[PDB]
Structure 1
Amino acid sequence: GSEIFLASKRAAITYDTDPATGEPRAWLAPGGTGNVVAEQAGVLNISWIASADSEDDRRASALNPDGVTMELHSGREILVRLIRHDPAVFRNVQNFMTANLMWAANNYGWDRWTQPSFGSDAREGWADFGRFTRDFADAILKSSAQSADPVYLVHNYQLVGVPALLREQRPDAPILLFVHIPWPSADYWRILPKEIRTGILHGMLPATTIGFFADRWCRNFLESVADLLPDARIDREAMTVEWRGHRTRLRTMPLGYSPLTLPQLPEGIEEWADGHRLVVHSGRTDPIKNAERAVRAFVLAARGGGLEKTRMLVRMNPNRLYVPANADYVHRVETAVAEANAELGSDTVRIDNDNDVNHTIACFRRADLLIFNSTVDGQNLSTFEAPLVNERDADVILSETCGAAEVLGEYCRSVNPFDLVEQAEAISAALAAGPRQRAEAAARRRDAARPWTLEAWVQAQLDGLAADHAARTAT
């Protein structure tokens, strides 16, 4: 029976009051990673350590300092411990991860000619990240003080410094670090200031296993290590790092969707889309989602004819609008949608900006063509969800730089996300395709997407960690 200690940037908890008694309730959101880990076979118990990121979170942590036991179905339970970081440190590290710095570092945001220019702001953000990293390590370790053989699962890029600190106190523990975002090319990674580009590698490599969604990110990580750490010896075939006694295995662990996640359309959208084939692009208000280039490509396609009764919905998820790169991205999309309507006709392209996840699934079902043309994406789960719920045999245009292209690229229209001509031709070809060809393609697409569930991904992590821990013990 494994004793699991899961660390992640957030533990999705819903806070409200009971509709009958009014007593305050806090219970876990279904479909989380912790809820799935607790269901696995070799799991005796599980603790979930995450950050307090709301005012409710701060009360819950202060009022239950060592963690609260939350009941799942089937009589399972998790000890959820929320860390109350320093407010000033937390807010700076949160800015440290946005496109103001670290997001642009791992999601290919800088042109090098004009950006970035690291000042004292980067040195202070890095110092605050260290304090934030120790906050997690001490909490994880204190939560696992009484465990004989704790198993550590460290998720999200915010925790890349945690493995070294865990290994410092627990030399023999299995430590998995999983990064949900891409790893950039060695030349791109070393844009970062020296203390950050090397210090981040020093924090991850003591892990037993480092997991990414895609082979490409594992490859770039290995090249970044070989480039920056001369005493490190990499093996691209075996996917391993040898560094100061640490043996580290790099693993690709693709994720697709959670069945528990898979309603009506947003207000006005159904009537607006009536009588028209509906092109749908969906994604967060993040520059990587590439909705501006999608809109331009839809215009280049419409100039080629055949799109007279076709409209485009740019479904958008508001997130971190306070980041200049995100707001600018919305502004650039709004411009392109304005110019698209100014040439093709009023109400040809529409933007819908909201958090209703049911509205997005409703858009997935209605779509006649799905565009997921990210400039880069750690994986992009929407490109798995959308074909699985779409009952219209919609084609899928998928960027080759999405992590999901390694799994689904053969079953989609794979495109260079920077080439408007190629993307316009894919839009035109996808809509010219007949009903029978689209139906057979969508069946092959759904079959390729179905196996990549949350549970299989968690099983991949545990089995993978178990095997590399056995290996690291022998070597």
Structure 2
Amino acid sequence: EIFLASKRAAITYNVVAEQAGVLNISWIASADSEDDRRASALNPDGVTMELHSGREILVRLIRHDPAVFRNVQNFMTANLMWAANNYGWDRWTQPSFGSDAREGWADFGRFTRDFADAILKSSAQSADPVYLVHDYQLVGVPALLREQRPDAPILLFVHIPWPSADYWRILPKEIRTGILHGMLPATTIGFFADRWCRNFLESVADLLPDARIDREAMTVEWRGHRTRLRTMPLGYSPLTLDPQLPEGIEEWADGHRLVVHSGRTDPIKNAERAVRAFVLAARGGGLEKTRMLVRMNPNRLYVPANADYVHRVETAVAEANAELGSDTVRIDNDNDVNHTIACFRRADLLIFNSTVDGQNLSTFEAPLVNERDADVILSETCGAAEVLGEYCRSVNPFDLVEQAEAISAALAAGPRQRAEAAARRRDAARPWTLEAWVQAQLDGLAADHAARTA
């Protein structure tokens, strides 16, 4: 009786996919490629997939209008909404919204309707449907489901940050209020971090004059709807972690301590500042036997900011080597999860210094697989820092001096200090499994639902 939906499914012929497997339910997601459109058309029952975890799932892909989907993905969600929720605008010079934003918003409504139709069509014969709506791209869905199913439990879980009210307000009026209107009819809105729940509540208080927020209870009362905000942290999926280095890396790292920065090709991952911080720390000859690997996993390169970030990182690494000597810093840029885990295991120092991050799962996974008791530098603005920051070197991701000094201190630490820190850090990470988080969703929603309906 549980229905699960999220936009992104990268199929070839994922946390939401693992959750589908845990609950043994179908997963409604978007067809993006032509192959998905064909597979979906040819397979009305859904497409079956085995995940690495060994879980096997059924995925129902929605065939959107291709132009609507193109605009929504490339412009609205991955670019505009991304910069709105992940703090990428300077205000002085960007953004400047024109007609494109309005057409994007209309297209967004159409995409939203596609998901609501799929979810309602699929649940139509269900007497007591439970709706789990995942991701920021589906923020419009709860209002549509609520209109048809006034009594259904609806969780909206957002995997990315929620920005401060002043920053949320950057968006065009129809969009900044329209998104909030779409979300509040949910029974429960979930984020990974208290800071995001707080920012959400402030955004609502600021923009919606009829809303009453309660900061202590973390609730909104708005036009009938009572909505509860919950923080439900996620760390890792053990079954997905249950590898070998990329080519050249083991021999290149052989006689050295290895610093690893790892993340998507997304500006929030902050590899440019990580490299510049390493350079400050290595500035001759502050460090001698150390190399740095920048592991990048290509993702949404249809966004200009993402392409431009890659170039900025490449430029920084070349400048690093020009300074520190040839082959001090390398980039390895592929989407092999096996390579990522291998890099995690080999690291002497792990850097997850994001400008901001909804959670950051790498900061749980990496210490859990690392067999060198690697120290971890973690940005204070990652959702993960609310659970793990006391066990890592928590840093301001904009301060190169602070980061360089953390790098230097981490590499100076002996194996006995590193052993003890790493043990505490693993102990803190270990409870935050995918299975526990799924349970947290259902438990939170069940509790809130009784009050929501009342």
User: TM-score scaled by structure 2?
Assistant: 0.95
Q: 2:113 aligns to what SS in structure 1?
A: helix
Measured after TM superposition, the shift of residue 320 of structure 1 is 1.9
Distance apart, 1:74 and its partner CA? 13
Alignment of 1:268-307 (within 5 A): 268-303=248-283, 305-307=285-287
Return closer, same or farther for 1:150/1:78 CA change in 2, 3 Å cut-off: farther
Could you say what secondary structure the match of 1:417 adopts?
coil
The 1:121–1:38 alpha-carbon spacing in structure 2 relative to 1, beyond 3 Å, is closer
Structure 2 vs 1, CA of residues 77 and 348 (structure 1 numbering), >3 Å: closer, same or farther? closer
Mean Cα deviation higher: 42-51 or 284-293: 42-51
Comparing 361-370 with 334-343, greater Cα deviation is found at 334-343
Note the 1:366-445 alignment, pairs <5 A.
366-445=346-425
Range moving further from structure 2, 301-310 or 260-269:
301-310
The answer to whether the Cα contact below 8 Å between 1:4 and 1:43 also exists between their aligned partners in 2 is no
Q: Residues 52 and 335 from structure 1, CA distance in 2 versus in 1: closer, same or farther, beyond 3 angstroms?
A: same
CA 1:377 to 1:71, structure 2 compared with 1: closer, same or farther past 3 Å?
closer
Q: Distance in 2 between matches of 1:473 and 1:213?
A: 25
Q: Is the 8 A contact 2:358 2:383 kept in 1?
A: yes
The structural deviation recorded for 1:97 is 3.8
CA RMSD of aligned residues (A): 2.4
Task: Give 1:312 shift.
Answer: 0.3
Shift of 1:46: 2.8
CA distance in 2, matches of 1:471, 1:77: 35
Deviation of the 1:44 alpha carbon: 8.6
Shift of 1:78: 5.7
Shift of 1:38: 11
* SS class of match (1:166): helix
Runs of 4+ in 1 over 6 A off after TM superposition: 35-45, 69-77
Give % identity. Answer: 100
Q: Are the aligned partners of 2:4 and 2:20 in contact in 1 as well (CA < 8 Å)?
A: no
Pairwise CA distance, 1:40: 9.6
C-alpha distance in 2, partners of 1:336/1:37?
A: 34
Deviation (angstroms), 1:82: 1.2
Q: Whole-Å Cα distance in 2 between the matches of residues 389 and 431 of structure 1? A: 19
Contact 1:98 1:104 in 2 (8 A): no
Write the distance in 1 (CA, Å) between the matches of 2:323 and 2:397. Answer: 23
Residues 99 and 325, structure 1, Cα contact 8 Å, conserved in 2: no
The answer to whether the Cα contact below 8 Å between 1:6 and 1:49 also exists between their aligned partners in 2 is yes
Secondary structure in 1 matching 2:93: coil
* Equivalent residue runs for 1:62-77 within 5 Å: 62-65=41-44, 67=46
CA distance in 1: counterparts of 2:169 and 2:8, whole angstroms: 28
> Comparing 258-267 with 225-234, which one deviates more in the overlay?
258-267
1:347-393 deviation digits (Å, cap 9, x = unpaired): 00011110111001100000000000000000000011000000101
Paired residues in the alignment total 453
Structure 2 regions of 5+ residues with no counterpart? none
CA contact (8 A) 2:268 2:356 kept: yes
- In the alignment, the residues of structure 2 paired with residue 380 and residue 118 of structure 1 have an alpha-carbon distance, to the nearest angstrom, of 30
For the structure 1 residues 8 and 228, does the alpha-carbon distance in structure 2 shift closer, same or farther, using more than 3 Å as the test? Answer: same
Say if 1:255 and 1:381, in contact at 8 Å, map to a contact too.
yes
Do the aligned residues in 1 keep the contact of 2:20 with 2:26 (CA within 8 Å)? no
Is the Cα contact below 8 Å between 1:314 and 1:349 reproduced in 2?
yes
Report the Cα offset of residue 260 of structure 1: 1.6
- The CA deviation at 1:307 is 1.2
Distance 1:69 1:315 in 2: 31
CA distance in 1, matches of 2:336, 2:23: 35
In structure 2, C-alpha distance between the alignment counterparts of 1:405 and 1:76, rounded to whole Å = 30
The superposition leaves residues 23-62 of structure 1 with CA deviations (integer Å, 9 ceiling, x where unpaired) of xxxxxxxxxxxx9999999999733211112223212221
Distance 1:303 1:8, change over 3 A: same
Q: 1:324 to 1:41 in 2, by over 3 A?
A: closer
Deviation larger for 62-71 or 278-287: 62-71
**What is the distance in 2 between the residues matched to 1:287 and 1:43?**
32
CA contact (8 A) 1:257 1:454 kept: yes
Per-residue deviation, 1:321:
2.0
Using the alignment, how far apart are the partners of 1:259 and 1:100 within structure 2? Answer: 32
SS at match of 1:384: helix
CA gap 1:247/1:98 in 2 versus in 1, 3 angstroms = closer
